[PDB]
Motif scaffolding. Structure first.
Motif, PDB file in Angstrom:
ATOM      1  N   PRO A  16       0.804  -1.231   0.000  1.00  0.00           N
ATOM      2  CA  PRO A  16       0.000   0.000   0.000  1.00  0.00           C
ATOM      3  C   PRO A  16       0.832   1.274   0.000  1.00  0.00           C
ATOM      4  N   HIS A  17       0.526   2.145  -0.968  1.00  0.00           N
ATOM      5  CA  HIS A  17       1.055   3.505  -1.090  1.00  0.00           C
ATOM      6  C   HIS A  17       2.576   3.543  -1.231  1.00  0.00           C
ATOM      7  N   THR A  18       3.122   2.726  -2.130  1.00  0.00           N
ATOM      8  CA  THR A  18       4.518   2.808  -2.540  1.00  0.00           C
ATOM      9  C   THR A  18       4.568   2.420  -4.012  1.00  0.00           C
ATOM     10  N   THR A  19       5.399   3.112  -4.793  1.00  0.00           N
ATOM     11  CA  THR A  19       5.459   2.935  -6.241  1.00  0.00           C
ATOM     12  C   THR A  19       6.458   1.837  -6.579  1.00  0.00           C
ATOM     13  N   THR A  20       5.998   0.829  -7.327  1.00  0.00           N
ATOM     14  CA  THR A  20       6.788  -0.328  -7.717  1.00  0.00           C
ATOM     15  C   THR A  20       6.236  -0.794  -9.061  1.00  0.00           C
ATOM     16  N   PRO A  21       7.085  -0.984 -10.073  1.00  0.00           N
ATOM     17  CA  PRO A  21       6.579  -1.204 -11.437  1.00  0.00           C
ATOM     18  C   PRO A  21       5.941  -2.572 -11.627  1.00  0.00           C
ATOM     19  N   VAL A  22       4.987  -2.630 -12.555  1.00  0.00           N
ATOM     20  CA  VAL A  22       4.369  -3.869 -13.016  1.00  0.00           C
ATOM     21  C   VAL A  22       4.353  -3.840 -14.541  1.00  0.00           C
ATOM     22  N   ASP A  23       4.895  -4.883 -15.160  1.00  0.00           N
ATOM     23  CA  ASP A  23       4.908  -5.018 -16.608  1.00  0.00           C
ATOM     24  C   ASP A  23       4.171  -6.290 -17.006  1.00  0.00           C
ATOM     25  N   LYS A  71      -1.327   4.334 -11.371  1.00  0.00           N
ATOM     26  CA  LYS A  71      -0.783   5.679 -11.493  1.00  0.00           C
ATOM     27  C   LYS A  71      -0.377   6.013 -12.928  1.00  0.00           C
ATOM     28  N   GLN A  72       0.482   5.196 -13.538  1.00  0.00           N
ATOM     29  CA  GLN A  72       0.895   5.408 -14.920  1.00  0.00           C
ATOM     30  C   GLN A  72       0.785   4.088 -15.675  1.00  0.00           C
ATOM     31  N   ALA A  73       0.518   4.180 -16.978  1.00  0.00           N
ATOM     32  CA  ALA A  73       0.379   2.983 -17.807  1.00  0.00           C
ATOM     33  C   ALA A  73       1.001   3.253 -19.169  1.00  0.00           C
ATOM     34  N   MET A  74       2.284   2.932 -19.321  1.00  0.00           N
ATOM     35  CA  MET A  74       3.011   3.232 -20.549  1.00  0.00           C
ATOM     36  C   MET A  74       2.632   2.236 -21.639  1.00  0.00           C
ATOM     37  N   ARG A  75       2.493   2.733 -22.864  1.00  0.00           N
ATOM     38  CA  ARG A  75       2.268   1.899 -24.040  1.00  0.00           C
ATOM     39  C   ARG A  75       3.597   1.687 -24.755  1.00  0.00           C
ATOM     40  N   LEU A  76       4.215   0.525 -24.549  1.00  0.00           N
ATOM     41  CA  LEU A  76       5.352   0.141 -25.380  1.00  0.00           C
ATOM     42  C   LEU A  76       5.047  -1.184 -26.062  1.00  0.00           C
ATOM     43  N   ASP A  78       4.963  -4.377 -27.453  1.00  0.00           N
ATOM     44  CA  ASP A  78       5.624  -5.514 -28.074  1.00  0.00           C
ATOM     45  C   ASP A  78       5.409  -6.746 -27.201  1.00  0.00           C
ATOM     46  N   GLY A  79       4.486  -6.634 -26.246  1.00  0.00           N
ATOM     47  CA  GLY A  79       4.281  -7.662 -25.245  1.00  0.00           C
ATOM     48  C   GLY A  79       4.595  -7.172 -23.845  1.00  0.00           C
ATOM     49  N   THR A  80       4.922  -5.885 -23.715  1.00  0.00           N
ATOM     50  CA  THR A  80       5.293  -5.291 -22.434  1.00  0.00           C
ATOM     51  C   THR A  80       4.645  -3.917 -22.314  1.00  0.00           C
ATOM     52  N   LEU A  81       3.926  -3.690 -21.215  1.00  0.00           N
ATOM     53  CA  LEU A  81       3.178  -2.457 -20.994  1.00  0.00           C
ATOM     54  C   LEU A  81       3.379  -2.023 -19.551  1.00  0.00           C
ATOM     55  N   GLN A  82       4.090  -0.916 -19.353  1.00  0.00           N
ATOM     56  CA  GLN A  82       4.517  -0.492 -18.018  1.00  0.00           C
ATOM     57  C   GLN A  82       3.338   0.124 -17.278  1.00  0.00           C
ATOM     58  N   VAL A  83       2.480  -0.725 -16.729  1.00  0.00           N
ATOM     59  CA  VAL A  83       1.365  -0.282 -15.901  1.00  0.00           C
ATOM     60  C   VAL A  83       1.827  -0.166 -14.447  1.00  0.00           C
ATOM     61  N   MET A  84       1.905   1.063 -13.952  1.00  0.00           N
ATOM     62  CA  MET A  84       2.491   1.342 -12.648  1.00  0.00           C
ATOM     63  C   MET A  84       1.406   1.246 -11.590  1.00  0.00           C
ATOM     64  N   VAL A  85       1.783   0.825 -10.389  1.00  0.00           N
ATOM     65  CA  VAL A  85       0.849   0.756  -9.272  1.00  0.00           C
ATOM     66  C   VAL A  85       1.474   1.379  -8.034  1.00  0.00           C
ATOM     67  N   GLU A  86       0.705   2.239  -7.380  1.00  0.00           N
ATOM     68  CA  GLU A  86       0.942   2.672  -6.007  1.00  0.00           C
ATOM     69  C   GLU A  86      -0.341   2.311  -5.270  1.00  0.00           C
ATOM     70  N   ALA A  87      -0.326   1.158  -4.608  1.00  0.00           N
ATOM     71  CA  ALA A  87      -1.524   0.480  -4.139  1.00  0.00           C
ATOM     72  C   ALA A  87      -2.211   1.244  -3.010  1.00  0.00           C
ATOM     73  N   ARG A  88      -3.436   0.822  -2.701  1.00  0.00           N
ATOM     74  CA  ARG A  88      -4.214   1.438  -1.636  1.00  0.00           C
ATOM     75  C   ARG A  88      -4.192   0.599  -0.366  1.00  0.00           C
ATOM     76  N   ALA A  89      -4.599  -0.667  -0.447  1.00  0.00           N
ATOM     77  CA  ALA A  89      -4.614  -1.562   0.704  1.00  0.00           C
ATOM     78  C   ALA A  89      -4.724  -2.999   0.215  1.00  0.00           C
ATOM     79  N   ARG A  90      -4.408  -3.931   1.104  1.00  0.00           N
ATOM     80  CA  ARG A  90      -4.535  -5.348   0.793  1.00  0.00           C
ATOM     81  C   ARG A  90      -5.987  -5.793   0.906  1.00  0.00           C
ATOM     82  N   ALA A  91      -6.264  -6.996   0.402  1.00  0.00           N
ATOM     83  CA  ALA A  91      -7.581  -7.611   0.476  1.00  0.00           C
ATOM     84  C   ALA A  91      -7.440  -9.107   0.252  1.00  0.00           C
ATOM     85  N   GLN A  92      -8.384  -9.870   0.791  1.00  0.00           N
ATOM     86  CA  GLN A  92      -8.409 -11.302   0.548  1.00  0.00           C
ATOM     87  C   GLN A  92      -9.084 -11.611  -0.780  1.00  0.00           C
ATOM     88  N   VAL A  93      -8.380 -12.365  -1.620  1.00  0.00           N
ATOM     89  CA  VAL A  93      -8.915 -12.867  -2.880  1.00  0.00           C
ATOM     90  C   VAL A  93     -10.004 -13.875  -2.522  1.00  0.00           C
TER      91      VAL A  93
END
Lengths: 247, 99, 49, 50
Positions: A16-23, A71-76, A78-93
């Motif tokens: 929650p509330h820290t920026t870490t990349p997701v591709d 937060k951000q979602a880059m369009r590159l 070729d099979g990779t899309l830099q969708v950034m997350v700075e989360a809010r809180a955890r939850a049970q799936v």
């Protein structure tokens, strides 16, 4: 919560509330990113297992997801899309629809944190102390020192605790164990215990370093004194006397 | 008050036992990992199976102790002229005598 | 020139050999440094008895 | 000598000990006595047909 897209975790745990990349590195999770751009930007990050099967398997997922507004979602594309997350809180799936790709319901925002913020912010201060004692002695894990500007001057203990939990680097499973906890108070106990264990490993490094230098000195000077004594023995006429039936 | 002080001391010492367990865990990782890497597949898993078996081979207490001492005088010799084989056959005997 | 080249290759070969002897030695001494610390865990305060 | 074990038919125990003495190989084979005696036991076993 609303069959939001399962975009898997690539060797990370989004806190929650820290920026870490997701591709993405697959078209399957790229379709989850496509509905992430399609379901108006509220995604459902679920942890998959250590190194993933090339399809998201039902054995991949784990119980505690996290809620993350993108937060951000880059369009590159070729099979990779830099969708950034700075989360809010955890939850049970809650459940899982088997894919590809996999759907998942999740719990509401974890906005519950305990009372007595005096003791919790004293624990924040002690965690800052322990992380200063950790990183200044563990440069050995290739740890960084701009991770201690990311703790000073902030007032959110959740963002603080997630900052010290992620920037004290370890395996994905222990960050997932941190992601299990709903308390603000025992999560800093978890981080303190892990860093105390690893400082115990640093003390272990110290004692085996001492012992290695000891072994160099002892085995070398033992060889030294053995050749000393045997040169002395060949200087004497005891080289003569060792003959019995030879004699 | 004294009871809650005991609560905090017990919690900190359970964390200390966890830290010592994980330090020993890394040290056992390195002993088996080096005697796998700088050894001949742990002498075809001989050390691994025996350190499993010293538990499994039900024994008396001092005998278990001496068996761990056989474990400790090894983990450096498995090519060896007797210095491997003497402690290896002695570990194999006191595993295969019925207690 | 052929025997020049074979001498160069065997010189590099024993160079790699010596470097492996040394590196193996440092790893062996590290191994024993790990090895020392179990019998001393067992050997504790018999002496006062 | 790695190919040799499934090149030559075996019983199960000869097969398995051949795999074992294959595994102790693949280092220096001119010294280092675990490797050379593994090579000898691998040759003296696997070149027995069955």
């Amino acid at each position: 919560r609303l069959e939001l897209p399962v975009i898997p975790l690539r060797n990370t745990v989004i806190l929650p509330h820290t920026t870490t990349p997701v591709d993405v590195g697959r078209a399957k999770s790229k379709r989850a990113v496509e509905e992430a751009m399609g379901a108006d930007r509220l995604i459902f990050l679920v942890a998959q297992r250590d190194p993933e099967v090339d399809d998201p398997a039902p054995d991949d997922l784990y119980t505690w997801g996290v809620q993350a507004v993108v937060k951000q979602a880059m369009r590159l594309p070729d099979g990779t899309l830099q969708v950034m997350v700075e989360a809010r809180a955890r939850a049970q799936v809650t459940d899982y629809i088997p894919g590809p790709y996999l759907r998942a319901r999740g719990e509401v925002f974890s906005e519950i944190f305990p009372i007595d913020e005096a003791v919790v912010r004293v624990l924040v201060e002690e965690l800052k102390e322990a992380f200063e004692k950790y990183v200044a002695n563990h440069k050995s894990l290739r740890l960084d020192r701009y991770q201690l500007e990311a703790v000073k001057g902030t007032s959110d203990p959740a963002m603080l605790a997630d900052t010290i939990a992620y920037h004290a680097t370890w395996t994905v499973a222990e960050k997932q164990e941190i992601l299990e906890l709903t308390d603000l108070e025992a999560r800093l106990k978890k981080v303190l215990g892990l860093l105390s264990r690893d400082l115990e490993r640093f003390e272990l490094d110290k004692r085996v370093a001492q012992r290695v230098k000891e072994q160099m000195d002892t085995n070398q000077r033992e060889y030294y004194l053995r050749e000393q004594m045997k040169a002395i023995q060949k200087e004497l006429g005891g080289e003569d006397g060792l003959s019995d039936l030879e004699a | 008050l004294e009871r809650f002080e005991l609560d905090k001391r017990v919690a900190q010492r359970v964390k200390e036992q966890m830290d010592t367990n994980q330090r020993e865990y890394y040290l056992r990782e390195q002993m088996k990992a080096i005697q796998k890497e700088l050894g001949g597949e742990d002498g075809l898993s001989d050390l691994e199976a025996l350190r499993k078996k010293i538990e499994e081979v039900g024994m008396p207490e001092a005998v278990k102790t001496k068996a761990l001492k056989e474990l400790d005088r090894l983990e450096r010799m498995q090519q060896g002229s007797p210095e491997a084989t003497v402690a290896r056959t002695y570990l194999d005997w006191l595993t295969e005598v019925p207690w």
